[PDB]
């Protein structure tokens, strides 16, 4: 189940990230603020738990989120741009790391780093700015669904119908949250209009 | 026009803020994150403007929020706990400051410090954790509406049906967003279950 | 006791803040980061206290700062730009607020808003980007020194010699920490090269 | 070139991190604020460059840091705890990623993931909470020095004497900035009193 968000400030953040003549500082801060918005939306169907706490007027009971039951998993590198934002929504959530890279020739993705915490029974939230062909997300899920997650959610700034197709086809139980679904993918597997080479725009030097 | 937010994460931030035995650091951080959510929600109906920018593939037109059209107005001191969260949603928004204080004997509010930028034609978003008797918000609006704002929004973590009444009776054109409408006001004008003396809990020493 | 910090990153943050064609977003972030540096430098001679804590390998004794012993006092409006960064150094410090504004004819200042926590025996750290004539700091000091604080420190991005001389002359006990001591003060009481109308550049509309 | 920092606030941040009973939220925030400090100290010798800019009073010439000429390199996953803090001092620096993992039997480190921007002629700053045996850092340097960086700096909250010795013995040109030099390494290659398993304390679950 795919879900495209329509909030005007998500569009703003997304479109603000499209602007190539912005500094890396601005891009990073924009995606972090977007990550907060995305994870916030993705957690709108979370169930709270009643717990007794202490207030200024004595003991009382209120509903709370079991922050520890949430596990964020950013795909380095771009996934990382969302992590700080995601943690602001859920400060005590665990964090898993997947080092993945797409083979620009075959368009396939491979895992070179995996440092995941105990995922069994918890709610996992994948973090990755773009969803192009879906190769990276497919390999990420493959690596994650093995630990028997309770539920897997994924957040992205933009997505290509191409990727949305396969994903929702081979991973129907996965919840996909997207800031904006773009037009298509080109001959090189880049989302159009997309964000170009965000990985390098974020932490290196963009070629555009 | 009152709107009570029902998002489970807002309820979590609010209740977390209800916890008296937390550190000032935790309270400030909690309310900063809640502020982001409250402002995010409050701008769900914001109108975007189309502008041309240079993307990685070339000049394209996308809809953007005119960040400078929004003006945040935190009521000192508590309102300040939402400022950073709000500025994350709209980084280049203008900021107005209102130094107000409630007489704990009559429960009347008075303005001691006013430093507001041009509000003429802009969307003003007032920030202040609690809306109890509505006194402080009334005085604030009284001086704000003069600048002939285009629209005035208000965000609060909690509010009492008491305050929501008068405010909506003398300022019906003002949109009031609240994380959770509490039960009532006590003998001393405090909200129940409310948050207590957050001002002192946030920057000084709580008397509870 | 005047101290002109010589750290290249402080100079950079200062000079960066001098750039007139930067967004409010960028300037606010610049100053927040500069604020962290200034307070860090201003607390280099702070005393730590031994306390027993539990580590991964059992109880142990280490030296810790008594965070609640420090009080940050931002002078609205400009001084608020330091508050966020100042709190990163000392998260649980107390926060006092002073709404002061300078009379642009006599070059003297008046306090319109004062909300301070207990200051007796505490270490007060005044926050305010500029120290021009020093009229604002003087008025702030008068108001603070009455509460008998254990020590008073002040951080500024920049300052004019005439301003410094004026403060150190009457307050030989106050420690002034400045990112850079500029050239002089023009006939209007503005520091040169200075930062211009910082308050408005930060939260409203600059006239330059 | 090794350098043990003595600033009380660094000591405080470092010692606060030793508190095993703190939430992941508190630890992450503490290390972020510490990372800022460590990097701030590490760039104290940084060289600035003169550039002409537009100020409120016209064009002027000031010294600035060429932010882009700086490259931060955290070692996953612990190194990530200093990233944001490090980026606060140099917002536009480039970011390199090194996925490393120590073998708990031989205490050897191996690089499974590498995503580095162009390091040739730049100032590289490695980020890693601890520096126990030196294996992780040694491997890292050997892939970084190959790019012929202008200079290499490294920051750590704590380091074991034996770790510092091999490093300084194999990389005399590398500047190692340490928050506090602990006592030693145990039989399992853990620093004492050390921080335990910070990687798990930060993003997963600690066994202590």
Domain ranges of chain C: 1-208
* Helix residue ranges, H only, chain D: 8-17, 24-42, 80-89, 135-144, 161-170, 198-203
Number of C-alpha atoms within 13 angstroms, CB side, residue D154?
30
Cβ-contact D111, D99 below 8 angstroms: yes
Burial of A158-168, coded b for 16+ CB within 10 Å and e otherwise, reads bbbebbbeebe
**Cβ-nearest to B64 among A16, A40, A64:** A16
Tokens of A205: 């030097």
- Using DSSP bridges, classify how beta strands D130-131 and D151-159 pair: parallel, antiparallel or unpaired: parallel
C144 φ/ψ angles, rounded to the nearest 5 degrees: -85, -50
Cβ-contact B7, B178 below 8 angstroms: no
Closest CA to A7 of A29, A40, A45: A40
Tokens of D12: 């405080």
For residue B105, give every residue at least 6 positions away whose Cβ sits within 8 Å of its Cβ, in sequence order, or none.
none
What distance in Å separates the CA atoms of residue D32 and residue D13, rounded to the nearest whole number? 9
- Using DSSP bridges, classify how beta strands B184-185 and B191-192 pair: parallel, antiparallel or unpaired: antiparallel
Burial of B23-32, coded b for 16+ CB within 10 Å and e otherwise, reads ebbbbbbbbb
Cβ-contact C37, D7 below 8 angstroms: no
Alpha carbon of residue C98 to chain centroid: 12
Which experiment gave this structure?
X-ray
What distance in Å separates the CA atoms of residue D2 and residue D83, rounded to the nearest whole number? 21
Is B132 annotated to bind a ligand? Reply is: yes
* Helix residue ranges, H only, A73-147: 80-89, 135-145
DSSP string, B32-96: HHHHHHHHHHHTTTPPPEEEEEEETTEEEEEEE--GGGEEEEEEETTTHHHHHHHHHHSTT-EE-
Beta-ladder partners of C63:
C50
**Minimum CA–CA partner of C26 in chain D:** D91
* D25/A115 Cβ within 8 A: no
Counting beta carbons within 10 angstroms of the beta carbon of residue A58, is it exposed (0 to 12), middle (13 to 18) or buried (19 or more)?
A: exposed
C206 φ/ψ angles, rounded to the nearest 5 degrees: -75, 145
What distance in Å separates the CA atoms of residue A122 and residue D85, rounded to the nearest whole number? 29
What distance in Å separates the CA atoms of residue A33 and residue A53, rounded to the nearest whole number? 30
- Three-state secondary structure call for residue B147: helix
- Specified resolution (Å): 2.2
**Cβ-nearest to D204 among A23, A94, A203:** A94
**Which residues of chain D are at the A interface, by a Cβ-Cβ cutoff of 8 Å?**
23-25, 28, 76-77, 80, 84, 87, 91-92, 94-97, 99, 101, 112-113, 115, 117-118, 199-200, 202-205
Q: Which helix (H) or strand (E) holds A38?
A: helix A24-42
Q: Which residue in this structure is represented by tokens 């879906």?
A: A134
Angle between helices A80-89 and B24-42 (to 10 degrees): 100
What distance in Å separates the CA atoms of residue B41 and residue B45, rounded to the nearest whole number? 9
Tokens of D13: 């941040």
Class of domain A1-208: alpha beta
Cβ-contact C141, C169 below 8 angstroms: no
Burial of D101-119, coded b for 16+ CB within 10 Å and e otherwise, reads bbeeeeeebebebbbbbeb
* Angle made by CA atoms A206, D66, D64, in degrees to the nearest 5: 145
CA distance from start to end of chain B: 33
Closest CA to A65 of D152, B13, B75: B13
Q: Which helix (H) or strand (E) holds C55?
A: strand C49-55
Q: Where are the beta strands (DSSP E) in chain A?
A: 2-4, 49-55, 58-64, 70-76, 94-95, 97-102, 109-115, 123-127, 130-131, 151-159, 175-181, 184-185, 191-192
Peptide bond into C124 cis (omega under 30): no
Among positive and negative, which fits the CA dihedral B198, B201, B202, B203? positive
Tokens of D155: 């920051």
What distance in Å separates the CA atoms of residue B101 and residue B32, rounded to the nearest whole number? 22
- Three-state secondary structure call for residue A137: helix
- Three-state secondary structure call for residue B197: coil
DSSP A132: S
Chains adjacent to A (≥3 CB pairs closer than 8 angstroms): B, C, D
Counting beta carbons within 10 angstroms of the beta carbon of residue C103, is it exposed (0 to 12), middle (13 to 18) or buried (19 or more)?
A: exposed
Cβ-contact A125, A86 below 8 angstroms: yes
* Angle made by CA atoms C93, C95, C99, in degrees to the nearest 5: 160
Alpha carbon of residue B103 to chain centroid: 21
Q: Where are the beta strands (DSSP E) in D103-204?
A: 109-115, 123-127, 130-131, 151-159, 175-181, 184-185, 191-192
Alpha carbon of residue B76 to chain centroid: 11
Q: Which residue in this structure is represented by tokens 């700015």?
A: A129
Alpha carbon of residue D193 to chain centroid: 19
Closest CA to D149 of D81, D90, D97, D72: D72
Instruction: Show residues of chain C in contact with D35, CB under 8 Å.
Output: none
Among positive and negative, which fits the CA dihedral C108, C114, C118, C123? negative
Instruction: Show residues of chain A in contact with B44, CB under 8 Å.
Output: 7-9
Cβ-contact A11, A157 below 8 angstroms: no
What distance in Å separates the CA atoms of residue B91 and residue A30, rounded to the nearest whole number? 9
Q: Which helix (H) or strand (E) holds B198?
A: helix B198-203
Among positive and negative, which fits the CA dihedral B28, B29, B30, B35? positive
DSSP string, chain C: -EEE---HHHHHHHHHHH-TTS-HHHHHHHHHHHHHHHHHHHTTTPPPEEEEEEETTEEEEEEE--GGGEEEEEEETTTHHHHHHHHHHSTT-EE-EEEEEE-TTT--EEEEEEE----BT-EEEEE-SEESSSHHHHHHHHHHHTT-BSEEEEEEEEE-HHHHHHHHHH-TT-EEEEEEE-SEE-TTS-EES--SSHHHHHHS----
Q: Which residue in this structure is represented by tokens 């012993």?
A: C69
* D21/C48 Cβ within 8 A: no
What distance in Å separates the CA atoms of residue C108 and residue C105, rounded to the nearest whole number? 8
Tokens of C85: 């960064």
CA distance C26 to chain A (A): 8
What distance in Å separates the CA atoms of residue C137 and residue C156, rounded to the nearest whole number? 11
Instruction: Show residues of chain B in contact with D25, CB under 8 Å.
Output: 26, 29
């Amino acid at each position: 189940m795919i879900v495209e968000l329509s909030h005007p400030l998500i569009k703003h953040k997304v479109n603000t990230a499209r602007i190539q003549d912005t500094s890396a500082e601005k891009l990073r801060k924009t995606l972090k603020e977007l990550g907060f918005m995305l994870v916030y939306e993705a957690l709108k169907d979370i169930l709270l738990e009643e717990k007794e706490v202490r207030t200024w007027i004595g003991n009382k009971r209120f509903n709370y989120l079991n922050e520890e039951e949430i596990v964020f998993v950013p795909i380095l590198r771009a996934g990382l741009s969302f992590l700080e934002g995601a943690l602001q929504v859920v400060p005590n959530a665990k964090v898993g790391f997947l080092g993945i890279k797409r083979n620009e020739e075959t368009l396939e993705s491979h895992i070179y780093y995996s440092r995941l915490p105990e995922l069994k029974g918890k709610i996992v939230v994948i973090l990755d700015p773009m969803l192009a062909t879906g190769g990276t997300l497919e390999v990420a899920l493959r690596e994650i669904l093995k630990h028997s997650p309770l539920k897997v959610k994924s957040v992205h700034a933009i997505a290509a119908p191409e990727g949305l197709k396969r994903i929702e086809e081979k991973f129907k139980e996965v919840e996909i949250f997207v800031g904006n679904v773009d037009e298509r993918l080109n001959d090189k597997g880049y989302i159009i209009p997309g964000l170009g080479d965000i990985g390098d725009r974020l932490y290196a030097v963009s070629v555009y």
